[PDB]
Amino acid sequence: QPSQQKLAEKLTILNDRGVGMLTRLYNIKKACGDPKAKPSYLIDKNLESAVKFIVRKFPAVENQQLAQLQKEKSEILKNLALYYFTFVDVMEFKDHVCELLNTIDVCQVFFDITVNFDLTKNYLDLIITYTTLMILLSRIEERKAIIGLYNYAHEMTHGASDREYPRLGQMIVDYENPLKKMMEEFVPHSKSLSDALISLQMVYPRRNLSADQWRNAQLLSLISAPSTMLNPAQSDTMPCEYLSLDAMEKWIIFGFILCHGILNTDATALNLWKLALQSSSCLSLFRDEVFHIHKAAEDLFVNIRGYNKRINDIRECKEAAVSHAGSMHRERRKFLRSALKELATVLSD
Amino acid sequence: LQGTILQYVKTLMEVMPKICRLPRHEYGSPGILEFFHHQLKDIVEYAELKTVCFQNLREVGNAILFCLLIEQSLSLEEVCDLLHAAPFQNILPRVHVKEGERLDAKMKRLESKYAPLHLVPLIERLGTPQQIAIAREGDLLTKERLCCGLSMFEVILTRIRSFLDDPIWRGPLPSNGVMHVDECVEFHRLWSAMQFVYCIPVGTHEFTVEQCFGDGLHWAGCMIIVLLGQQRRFAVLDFCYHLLKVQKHDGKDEIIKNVPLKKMVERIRKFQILNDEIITILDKYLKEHVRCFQPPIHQSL
Amino acid sequence: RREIGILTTNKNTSRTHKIIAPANLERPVRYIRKPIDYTILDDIGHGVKV
Amino acid sequence: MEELRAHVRKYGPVMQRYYVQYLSGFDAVVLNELVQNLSVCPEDESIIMSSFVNTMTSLSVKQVEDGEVFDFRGMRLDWFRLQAYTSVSKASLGLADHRELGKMMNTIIFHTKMVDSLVEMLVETSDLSIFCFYSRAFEKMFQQCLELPSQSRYSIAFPLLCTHFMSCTHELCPEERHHIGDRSLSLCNMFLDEMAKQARNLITD
Amino acid sequence: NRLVVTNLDKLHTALSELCFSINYVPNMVVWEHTFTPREYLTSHLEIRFTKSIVGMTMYNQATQEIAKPSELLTSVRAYMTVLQSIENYVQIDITRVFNNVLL
């Protein structure tokens, strides 16, 4: 039953859903990071003792400690329900993603960015959206307190815990170090993910060149070959020509972490990962929330046995990024100003 | 334009190099400077370029400047006339409204105050049919000025464009069906050669082009380009602008054929600024379907 | 005036406000939770039903 | 970037015209030549691919001239669907054995976007709503632009960027939309006021 | 020589460069609101012209000093000449700001 799996539909719908979830979670993290925007129950000096109890005992649900919490139970359920059920929607999203990724494994899917562009891109987007969403969640320090308070207020109102709490409390704990959990979770996904990412070698490297190489190719010049001005600008990989370099870089960096096994076995995959590691010092999780690549990658790899060769790669790539990436990007911007100016002007004429 | 300038444009377009490509960045700014020197040698050495060609252009520029500036003076003269006409023509400025008052309430009340000054109504009340008719005609002449809704500079420019009907301003149809690039068959390209000449630094005790001709020279040269619709192609294809672009990138400084490159590109920037101001002004005052192209077609149909 | 009139054209200059708000301000929409639905694209193109 | 975006918005019809012809008069021929050379493929796949050809041939420049609103969401999702059908293992029509089909189809999909998706394409390739979340840097870049005469020429880029801000919102978080909206209006107003004040100051001098 | 840069050169260049931006687009639409850049300039020029005129009168109650009318008029005329030139750069009716301020 492979033609009734509805991959195109499921990938489209889940990718859109995840962006929405990232947006909601982003706003929880910002509000909870700001003491003037935080929910009052986390600031209040009186309730801090009741909060400390819940956090320490999380996820186990169960007194003089919940004395202040007792009278404010209805207001806690009222004001924390928005945040709580956002966390619930993050979990349900995760369950849907995991199911789709398992289905794809079973279907043994051929992935090539230069061939099935939409299938490959969606597959990679979803994995990265999933990954960045779990990392973002891990940065919401007050998430246990929030989920706990809502549930503890729920059990002293309706008798028992919330329907989703047991499974939600588990996800929070299981993904507390999100990339470590995800690296082991993606072992069975590793074959198809590495296939899709390796296909990126036909695009990313040639899209990641220097200003000097852009001048040699006279990139974006309409007038370098005057007799071709009528001829259509085309290639056999059209959507690949303008696909964001920023998006690809995240695919490569996180993706190869998730199928780390291939970094020891495949030089093509290793060299691709390193090219990406040499190009930035941080990535965008979502908007202005950034992920510092080399520190986080080292932390993960120092705690695994068979990858104590990879620490050298990370650090060598880190120095190259700090030393050369800035200037390489600076030269690109100089080139692009000239190229876009000339392009705009010819097109207006 | 149709006489001596046309004559020298036709002459210099032939002396001009048939084809002139903008050399790639990699050659370096010094080499690009050397390239332009050689390629444009005959424009550089043309004995009457300043005495005749720049001179006649400066005169065109000064003429077009006179029109712009005289229109502006006229506008200043008219606006002052109208301000003094205002009290006899019922025209009142906006008045300050304190709380508890209306804008319409006081403006009507102030109109009452200055009603004895309203000229035409007063004569219509107390004057003879001859007096009334003269005042009515006088009032129409006083209120209806050019500054009210009319301008002239656009008409001046539109009419100068029709003086450029000779085929050597625009040249032959482009080989590629789009635009000329390497070919030097359009006026803007000759202007680029002329710009090369006037950007060359001279001795510390020699007079410069700006000392000799002032801005009028550039107003004329830029006016021709704009009216021919050549300003975008000039911006892209200009020799000096290209040299400046490459020098900015590589930051090299050599004395090529007695032209110190740094000094040369500094001057180019100054004229680039001036040209852009002039072109922008001309375009502003000179306030549809485009040429479309065919996608590839299969032998099938 | 007739003689100078030959050299004139209308100047296309008009006055307006710095900011013009739209006739209808955008209505604020309340957030309602709804589950993941895999059928919302079935009517787009050649869809397939469960 | 704003100039390129403005060209696309102003001369949209030019691009639509070019690509409706490309779709109807070339793409449809080569896609037909390729589909007819397939020896074996299931009915579901064959229905989809013939619909591509049917859709493309039934287009004409007249539709552009008349100002019709094109919709190719169906065609694009069907190619996506077809990718899924032909990429699973033991598929009767295997895309890995027909690479040239996918490359041709990706080109064709780009062509459909040049007809109906020019507004969306500008968002995809050039949205800078990100500045909404780097407001300090946004304002600082503006000031730096204004204080440098050769760059102040381009200062209008900042108010123009304020039009992007709404593109950062999602239907699942309407709570933030008005806040971002009000931020875009406040910044646009401030930029335009500051540009005017500087011109005022230079004129006074 | 154009390499010798006067204060007036600097001011003139900076003015023309910025007016290119102010005049670049007639209006823009941000979240369904329409913004008209030139109208910010018009408004500020009205207010500034008013401000400068009263300023150049050099009036002081305490010392009983005020500008000679001829000198004020000379300065007002110079201002008007410069302000008139703005029409070279921006699609604005300076005549109507003159009207507004002076009347």
Ligand SMILES: [Cl-]
């Ligand atoms: Cl914000």
